Each structure stands twice: as structure tokens, then as C-alpha cells.
Amino acid sequence: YIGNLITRQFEGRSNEIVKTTTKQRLDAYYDLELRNSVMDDILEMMPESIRQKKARTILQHLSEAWRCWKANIPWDVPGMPAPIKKIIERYIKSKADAWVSAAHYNRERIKRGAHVEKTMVKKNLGRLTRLWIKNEQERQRQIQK
Amino acid sequence: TSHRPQLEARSGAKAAAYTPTGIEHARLLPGHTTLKYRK
Amino acid sequence: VAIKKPKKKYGTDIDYNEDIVYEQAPMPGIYDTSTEDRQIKKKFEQFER
Amino acid sequence: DEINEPPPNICEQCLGDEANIRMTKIPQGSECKICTLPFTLYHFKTSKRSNNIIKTLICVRCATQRNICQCCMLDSRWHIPIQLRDHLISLVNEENVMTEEAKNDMMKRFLSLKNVKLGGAQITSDPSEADNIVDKLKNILLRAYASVDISHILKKLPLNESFLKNPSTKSFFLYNIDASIPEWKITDTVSQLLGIKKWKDGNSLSLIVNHKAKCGGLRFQSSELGERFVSKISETLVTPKGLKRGVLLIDRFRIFIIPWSSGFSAASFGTNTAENIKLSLSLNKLIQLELG
RNA sequence: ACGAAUCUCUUUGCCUUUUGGCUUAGAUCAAGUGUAGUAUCUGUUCUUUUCAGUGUAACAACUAAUGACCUCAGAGGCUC
Ligand SMILES: [Zn+2]
Ligand SMILES: [Zn+2]
Known part of the structure; x- marks a missing residue:
């Protein structure tokens, strides 16, 4: 304990501090890996001549479409290339499975009563009411069809 | 602005040329010091 | 009275004006850029004159 | 590489004359004077009974890029300073060679980690490329204020009296002193003439030279030295x-x-620099009037 | 309706200062009546100051410093 303290006095803090993933920065790190994976797959599809500008705009459609899936609004872009639209719909459903299964897993925690954070109760409250109304809107369309 | 995505990740090329510190971490203490070999 | 410099905000802060801060020289090629550098140095000293 | 490191570059004249030297290696000793980055401090003594530790001041990377030793930082061949080395190569290749050094701590560390040679370190550490330039040194050896009211001052300068034996004075007036010819060189020439060497112990002579007015004066204690200064000077010029x-x-x-x-x-001689320049300009005529 | 080059112009191509994350859209969406606190101005009080001792006569000190000359290795003497 003191041997780290004294060497911090004499030598200073190391500049190579690498933050481990933690409960507080898991949701951010899940997004950094997700934007990288979508960026890599779309950039291979591109025949040629794609730069830091065109890779910057395409990652918007991903962010917009995740909002549309949360809204249960169908996400259709006119003039969108069908391979890229095939890619973006895939990663949303990847993210949808993590979004839904984390919502199930935390409800089982809350019913047991075993150490759920005060913010996490409100987040799980918000995740379910998306899922319940989404299940409601699916059932309305099946009756209509 | 001031809230941005990443264009590239932090590379390990930069931390390799730094001088080390040699701070002693709790998880780098000696543990499981013997390897097991398969038959 | 000379212009005051902006003070160092940290220890290894860099005066960009004093030196070429990360001089990557052009790679040595085979075409002998000797007289061209003399004409630059003559023109660069002429410009600051 | 921390487990594969070069041997240190030290001169022969830092190590001295003795055969076996006990040298102490400290693996991260002091930090380098040049690149401000740590290194293996070697330090040693010439003899066992000596009283001066000779440390390596710079790292081996800064010592290789300049081709100098780590202790005295003179060049490994020719054993001269770096500023004089890069000047001697400048007279041979007719272009300025110079090792330039960053004032910036991020650009002192940057400039050391590159594997280039700096300045005359391409010419030196190649023995073929160094000996031929010494041969090219050898052919070089085959060549081998009109508004000022100065009238208050020139009354006090003698300028009208003669250098005979018969006056017995302590002080003298030296004029026609160039802007070269340093104050120590005039006291050494007088003390060589009298044999009153190590004059600064007894304070036999005191000399003031302006170097702007091109004039001066030297004061003696014990006026009997004044006849020794007169009689030991043979050559004189008589104004017409x-x-x-x-x-x-x-x-x-x-x-x-x-x-x-x-x-x-x-x-x-003067009480202002602008005023003293006109006294040299005043004299230049009298020197030409004395000679011609 | 085809000139060898300059300027002025139209159309294609190129898009050039041409939307840079995340989560629970990240979260929420303004007083009718009856009384306080802070700032500024205005008024009052207290505090922050010292020496002089009328007139006349007599005596002493001051208006140390500056300039010039000389000796000694800055001081000493003299004059203004
Ligand atoms: Zn160094
Ligand atoms: Zn040496």
C-alpha cells in the first residue's frame, strides 16, 4: 500500500492507465464495439473511394434505426443500398437480443430483491414498457391481418 | 459538439515507447505459480 | 520590448516556434538534392530579409 | 532493448594511463544531459587513490549520434570539442555542417531515439572518411559623431610630451590599441619585459584599457620601476x-x-560609449600625423 | 459548321465549410392571497490627523553638497 504511494511520489503516475470494463461503463463500451463492427463490414462492401467522411455518415443510419426499433417504427430509408440495409438490420437484431435478454435478466434480479441499483430499477422499468407495448402492437396487427 | 464517436482506437504503439513505472498491483501478485502439463 | 510567450501549462509543454517539433526528414533518394537546397536557403534568407 | 545494451563510449584520456579500472554500473542511474532520459550511469576513478569520480554524463545513444565519449563529450577521434569539429569540416566541404539540438523536452527525447548521425558524426567514426579530410586540412595550411564636444578630455590626455628617460613618472598613456589585443596580453608583455612575472600577487602594475577609445593607461607602483620600463624599451618613433x-x-x-x-x-578616456568612439577617431589622425 | 491558343457562358462528372457516441425520447415542464432575506441610496453617531504660543534686542547654527587644482594608493589640504 505505501510502496505504491512512495513510488507515486518519486516517479509519478503511469501514463498507460487502461480502464477495465465495469458496470458503469459497460453500456458505453458495448456501443464502441458495435459501431466498430458495423463500420468494418460496410467498408468491405464498398467497391472503392470511401473516406473518413463517408464512414461518418453511415453510422448515423445505424443510430437512427436503433431508435426506430425502440420506437417500433419500421425503419425504411428510400434509396438505401440493399446490402448495407441487410447489414444494419442484422446488427440491430444482435443488439436487440442483448437489449431484451438484459431486460429479462434484471427482472429476475428485482423479483429476488438482490442488489439492484436505483437507476437500474428505472431503466428496467423503461425497457419493459417498450417490450409490453411492442408485444401489444404485434398482437393488434395479428388480429387485423 | 464535445461528445464524439471514435475514428480510431488508442493504439498500443504509444504506450510501448513510454518509460514504465513499476507500481505494484494487487492482481499481479504471484498466484497459480505452477503450470500443469497434459499427459 | 519583446513579445511575451504563452506560459507552459504543463511541464513538457512545447514551444512550436523554437524548433521543428517532429522533424521527419525526407527519405534519402538517389537524385542528389544539393543545389536545390542552396537556392531555398538563399530564397528563405531573402524572404526574412 | 533493456537486456541488450551497447558498451559505453569513453575516451582513452578519461580512462587515463592505468591498465585495470574498477568501474561501477548502475542500470538506471542519472538521466542524460542531452535527451533528459535515463540510462546506465557508469562511473570510475583513474587510480585507486584518486579523489575525483569521473561519471558518464550522457547516454550511449546521445554519445553515438554525436560520436563523442560519455564522460568528457569530446570527439572519439581527433579529441576536440563538437563546436570546433563542425567548424573544421565546414572549411573542407565549404558548407555548414552542424548538429542542432532542440530546446524542447519532447523534442530532446524525439531526436535521440533516431538512428542517424548528427553533424560531423558521419565524417568521424569512418576512418577512411576522416583521414582524407585531414589531408584536405593540409592543403589549407599551404595557404597558411562629429557633434561631440570632446575638448574637455583631450586636455587631460598628454599627446604633446615626449618619452625620455628624464621624467620619473608612475603612469603612462597607451594609445593605438586595437579592438583585438586583450587586456591580459598587454600586462604580460610588460611583465615579460621587466621580469616582474606573477605581477598580480604584488600588484606592481595596474592597467586600464577601454577598447572603444582604442586608448589606455598603465599605472606602476614604486616609480623606480618607471625607469626600468623606459630603459627596457629600445625602439621609438620621433614625430617630424x-x-x-x-x-x-x-x-x-x-x-x-x-x-x-x-x-x-x-x-x-570617456564617460559615454558614444563619446569614447570619437576619441579613437580623434587619435587616428595623430597616429597618421606621428608616422606620416 | 471544324480552327492553335486567353476571357465570358451552359450542361454532365466531381460535392468540396455538404448533421461526429451512449441510456430510462437520459429525466422533467411555473402562484390568487398573507407575512421574510440580500444589495444600493439617504440621515445620525463613533474611529483613522498635529502643532502653535504676540513684539523688539543680542549670540550661535543652517540656505552639508557641487566645481576646479595638487599629493598619496578613494582619502587629505586649499580656493570659489
Ligand atoms: Zn541522451
Ligand atoms: Zn572523454
Whole structure:
């Protein structure tokens, strides 16, 4: 304990501090890996001549479409290339499975009563009411069809 | 602005040329010091 | 009275004006850029004159 | 590489004359003077009974890029300083070679980690490329203020009296002193002439030279030395009116003297730099009037 | 309706200062009546100051410093 303290006095803090993933920065790190994976797959599809500008705009459609899936609004872009639209719909459903299964897993925690954070109760409250109304809107369309 | 995505990740090329510190971490203490070999 | 410099905000802060801060020289090629550098140095000293 | 490191570059004249030297290696000793980055400090002593530790001040990367030793930082061949080395190569290749050093701590560390040679370190550490330039050094050896009211001051400068034996004075007036010819060189020439060497112990002579006015004066204690200073000077110049003046004789130069017959002091030559330049301009005519 | 080059112009191509994350859209969406606190101005009080001792006569000190000359290795003497 003191041997780290004294060497911090004499030598200073190391500049190579690498933050481990933690409960507080898991949701951010899940997004950094997700934007990288979508960026890599779309950039291979591109025949040629794609730069830091065109890779910057395409990652918007991903962010917009995740909002549309949360809204249960169908996400259709006119003039969108069908391979890229095939890619973006895939990663949303990847993210949808993590979004839904984390919502199930935390409800089982809350019913047991075993150490759920005060913010996490409100987040799980918000995740379910998306899922319940989404299940409601699916059932309305099946009756209509 | 001031809230941005990443264009590239932090590379390990930069931390390799730094001088080390040699701070002693709790998880780098000696543990499981013997390897097991398969038959 | 000379212009005051902006003070160092940290220890290894860099005066960009004093030196070429990360001089990557052009790679040595085979075409002998000797007289061209003399004409630059003559023109660069002429410009600051 | 921290487990594969070069041996240190030290001169022969830092190590000295003895055969076996016990040297102490400290694996991260002090930090380098040049790149401010740590290294293996080697330190040693010439003999066992010596009283001076000789440390390596710079790292081996800064010592290789300049081709110098780590201890005295002189060049490994020719054993000369770096500023004089890059000047001697400048007279051979007719272009300025120079090792330039960053003032910036991020650009002292940057400039050391590159594997280049700096300045005359391409010429030196190649023995073929160094000996031929010494041969090219050898052919070089085959060549081998009109508005000022100065009239208050020139009354006090003698300028009208003669350098004879007969006046017995302490002070003298040296004019025709170039902007070269340093104050120590005139006291050494007088003390060589009298044999009163190590004069600064007894304070036998005191000399004031301006180097702007191109004039000066030297004061003696014990006036009997004044006849020794007169009699030990043989060559004199007589102005075509008269009024003979002795010549002190610094190498290739000529310095004229007249007994002041009082103590001149400081400020006799001038009390302002702009004012002193006109006294040299005043004299330049009288030197030409004395000679021609 | 085809000139060898300059300027002025139209159309294609190129898009050039041409939307840079995340989560629970990240979260929420303004007083009718009856009384306080802070700032500024205005008024009052207290505090922050010292020496002089009328007139006349007599005596002493001051208006140390500056300039110049000389000796000694800055001081000493003299004059203004
Ligand atoms: Zn160094
Ligand atoms: Zn040396």
C-alpha cells in the first residue's frame, strides 16, 4: 500500500492507465464495439473511394434505426443500398437480443430483491414498457391481418 | 459538439515507447505459480 | 520590448516556434538534392530579409 | 532493448594511463544531459587513490549520434570539442555542417531515439572518411559623431610630451590599441619585459584599457620601476615635429606610450560609449600625423 | 459548321465549410392571497490627523553638497 504511494511520489503516475470494463461503463463500451463492427463490414462492401467522411455518415443510419426499433417504427430509408440495409438490420437484431435478454435478466434480479441499483430499477422499468407495448402492437396487427 | 464517436482506437504503439513505472498491483501478485502439463 | 510567450501549462509543454517539433526528414533518394537546397536557403534568407 | 545494451563510449584520456579500472554500473542511474532520459550511469576513478569520480554524463545513444565519449563529450577521434569539429569540416566541404539540438523536452527525447548521425558524426567514426579530410586540412595550411564636444578630455590626455628617460613618472598613456589585443596580453608583455612575472600577487602594475577609445593607461607602483620600463624599451618613433614616443610591441601591433606624469584613472578616456568612439577617431589622425 | 491558343457562358462528372457516441425520447415542464432575506441610496453617531504660543534686542547654527587644482594608493589640504 505505501510502496505504491512512495513510488507515486518519486516517479509519478503511469501514463498507460487502461480502464477495465465495469458496470458503469459497460453500456458505453458495448456501443464502441458495435459501431466498430458495423463500420468494418460496410467498408468491405464498398467497391472503392470511401473516406473518413463517408464512414461518418453511415453510422448515423445505424443510430437512427436503433431508435426506430425502440420506437417500433419500421425503419425504411428510400434509396438505401440493399446490402448495407441487410447489414444494419442484422446488427440491430444482435443488439436487440442483448437489449431484451438484459431486460429479462434484471427482472429476475428485482423479483429476488438482490442488489439492484436505483437507476437500474428505472431503466428496467423503461425497457419493459417498450417490450409490453411492442408485444401489444404485434398482437393488434395479428388480429387485423 | 464535445461528445464524439471514435475514428480510431488508442493504439498500443504509444504506450510501448513510454518509460514504465513499476507500481505494484494487487492482481499481479504471484498466484497459480505452477503450470500443469497434459499427459 | 519583446513579445511575451504563452506560459507552459504543463511541464513538457512545447514551444512550436523554437524548433521543428517532429522533424521527419525526407527519405534519402538517389537524385542528389544539393543545389536545390542552396537556392531555398538563399530564397528563405531573402524572404526574412 | 533493456537486456541488450551497447558498451559505453569513453575516451582513452578519461580512462587515463592505468591498465585495470574498477568501474561501477548502475542500470538506471542519472538521466542524460542531452535527451533528459535515463540510462546506465557508469562511473570510475583513474587510480585507486584518486579523489575525483569521473561519471558518464550522457547516454550511449546521445554519445553515438554525436560520436563523442560519455564522460568528457569530446570527439572519439581527433579529441576536440563538437563546436570546433563542425567548424573544421565546414572549411573542407565549404558548407555548414552542424548538429542542432532542440530546446524542447519532447523534442530532446524525439531526436535521440533516431538512428542517424548528427553533424560531423558521419565524417568521424569512418576512418577512411576522416583521414582524407585531414589531408584536405593540409592543403589549407599551404595557404597558411562629429557633434561631440570632446575638448574637455583631450586636455587631460598628454599627446604633446615626449618619452625620455628624464621624467620619473608612475603612469603612462597607451594609445593605438586595437579592438583585438586583450587586456591580459598587454600586462604580460610588460611583465615579460621587466621580469616582474606573477605581477598580480604584488600588484606592481595596474592597467586600464577601454577598447572603444582604442586608448589606455598603465599605472606602476614604486616609480623606480618607471625607469626600468623606459630603459627596457629600445625602439621609438620621433614625430617630424619632435616628441619621441616609445613603442610597446605586441605581436604585429604597435602601441605608443607617453609618460602621463599624473594618475589618469578610469573615465579619462570617456564617460559615454558614444563619446569614447570619437576619441579613437580623434587619435587616428595623430597616429597618421606621428608616422606620416 | 471544324480552327492553335486567353476571357465570358451552359450542361454532365466531381460535392468540396455538404448533421461526429451512449441510456430510462437520459429525466422533467411555473402562484390568487398573507407575512421574510440580500444589495444600493439617504440621515445620525463613533474611529483613522498635529502643532502653535504676540513684539523688539543680542549670540550661535543652517540656505552639508557641487566645481576646479595638487599629493598619496578613494582619502587629505586649499580656493570659489
Ligand atoms: Zn541522451
Ligand atoms: Zn572523454
